Design a binder for these strands. Structure first.
Ligand SMILES: [Mg+2]
Ligand SMILES: [Mg+2]
Ligand SMILES: [Zn+2]
Ligand SMILES: [Zn+2]
Ligand SMILES: [Zn+2]
Ligand SMILES: [Zn+2]
Lengths: 162, 162
DNA sequence: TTGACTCTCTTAAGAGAGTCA
DNA sequence: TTGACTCTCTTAAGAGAGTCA
């Protein structure tokens, strides 16, 4: 098993490498009609990505290190959380982008939470629009708003009451 | 089936059958510390379900009718919307439960919207807590709340800014 | 040990279609 | 014609593991 020291060294090498990813300034809605700025550290679009990084899917990457002759591999956004519990309330913990930018590996834009909590941030009104997330959102969710519902509740007859 | 008359006949037959489903009263959060009551028309847990209905998954059903001597079949919650566009913005339209109760087939608890709009209602604060859905929610979403995030954004070094 | 590819899987909101009697 | 089962699929937020040089 990897020791605490070895895990800390993986986290540190990951941070060193991600800290050299291009830093892109994004203007984002915060809710309440306010605009803010996020600084995303974006993995390149194509190889090479950075030492230890490889693309396993269109927007999926992994980080790999060999320690004492054993190959270890992690989801590329999971590395900041290697010293944290991997499950909570029965559910697996997932890396969750507060900036909603998959290529971003800025650990200040990531949290570690259930997939339901992760998904729900997509619709959050944002830190200046009523976010109630205990770990606060950094921006209004990209899918927040009135929606585009095609047809609402309706009946042709009188068989139903709401 | 193809004709408008045939489709209206399908909707009317579906409404008559679902209208005989047991009516279950559910007391629900509305947001803003308020509570309301919904009357769900719940498909039975086991066969028989009702004329034209059959279970294709743990919480999936289908409605089928024989028209022009051929079997026509639909997802059981899609029938109210057979005269509506089946896509929006290039996204598939889905039956979406405003009561978040899959066994319910009350068309006054259903809308027709993209899967993203559908999902997002799970986290809505509700009609008395700030719902901004143009087709308004009937209740606060079951996943609304602070969440249970295990770890928030963090770095070990000084490579990153928010 | 490392890079750059390859493959399939999970979840929870939703689907279509085939086999029998 | 109708009923009661069977199977796999879609999406968009996330995953694990293999091959080859
Ligand atoms: Mg997310
Ligand atoms: Mg829904
Ligand atoms: Zn970011
Ligand atoms: Zn939030
Ligand atoms: Zn209902
Ligand atoms: Zn709503």
């Amino acid at each position: 098993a990897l020791t605490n020291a070895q895990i800390l060294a993986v986290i540190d090498s990951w941070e060193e490498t991600v800290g050299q990813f291009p830093v892109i300034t994004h203007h984002v809605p915060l809710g309440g009609g306010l605009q803010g700025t996020l600084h995303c550290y974006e993995i390149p679009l194509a190889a090479p990505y950075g030492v230890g990084f490889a693309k396993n899917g269109p927007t999926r990457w992994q980080y790999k290190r060999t320690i004492n002759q054993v190959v270890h591999r992690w989801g590329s956004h999971t590395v900041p959380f290697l010293l944290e519990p991997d499950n909570i309330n029965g559910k697996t913990c997932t890396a969750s982008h507060l900036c909603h930018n998959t290529r971003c590996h800025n650990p200040l834009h990531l949290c570690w939470e259930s997939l339901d909590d992760n998904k729900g941030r997509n619709w959050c009104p944002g830190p200046n629009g009523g976010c109630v997330h205990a770990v606060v959102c950094l921006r209004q969710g990209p899918l927040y708003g009135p929606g585009a519902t095609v047809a609402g509740p309706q009946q042709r007859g009188s068989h139903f009451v709401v």
